[PDB]
Amino acid sequence: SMNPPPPETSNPNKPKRQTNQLQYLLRVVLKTLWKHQFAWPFQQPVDAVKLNLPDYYKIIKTPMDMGTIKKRLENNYYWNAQECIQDFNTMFTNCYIYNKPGDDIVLMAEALEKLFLQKINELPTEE
Numbered sequence: 001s002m003n004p005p006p007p008e009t010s011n012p013n014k015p016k017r018q019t020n021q022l023q024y025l026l027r028v029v030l031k032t033l034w035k036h037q038f039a040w041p042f043q044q045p046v047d048a049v050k051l052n053l054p055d056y057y058k059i060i061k062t063p064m065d066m067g068t069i070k071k072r073l074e075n076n077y078y079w080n081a082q083e084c085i086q087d088f089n090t091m092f093t094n095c096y097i098y099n100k101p102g103d104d105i106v107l108m109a110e111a112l113e114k115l116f117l118q119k120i121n122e123l124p125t126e127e
């Protein structure tokens, strides 16, 4: 029923980099998905109390959302692009796991994931 603490966005002992691929993930990938008309359900951690989803965190044990990804990118939380790409994929997969096929939220995730895949296909080579 209750909400868990959110995923971490700050860890001073975690080594960090600012690479051109990570810059692309913020400037192109995150920005493109964030401005999309279907972004709103994914811009913050799922609030299972407000949405009356008492079983959400019984089912979803690796929660992820673009609000967290945005903070991670802006705070240079990552070492490499694969870490961030994994966070996006976790977000999409959680939606498909928890929800039923054809639900509005699933159609929304699918539209964002299509754009995500298009942008990742053009991920620049590491400088």
Ligand SMILES: Cn1cc(-c2cc(S(C)(=O)=O)ccc2OCC2CC2)c2ccccc2c1=O
Residues within 6 Å of the ligand: 040, 041, 042, 044, 045, 046, 047, 048, 050, 051, 053, 094, 095, 098, 099, 104, 105
């Ligand atoms: C990822 N995700 C996100 C939402 C969700 C979360 C929030 S909020 C600010 O409270 O966090 C607000 C709206 C939301 O959905 C709206 C779309 C369905 C029209 C959601 C809601 C019900 C069931 C599953 C999910 C889910 O799987």
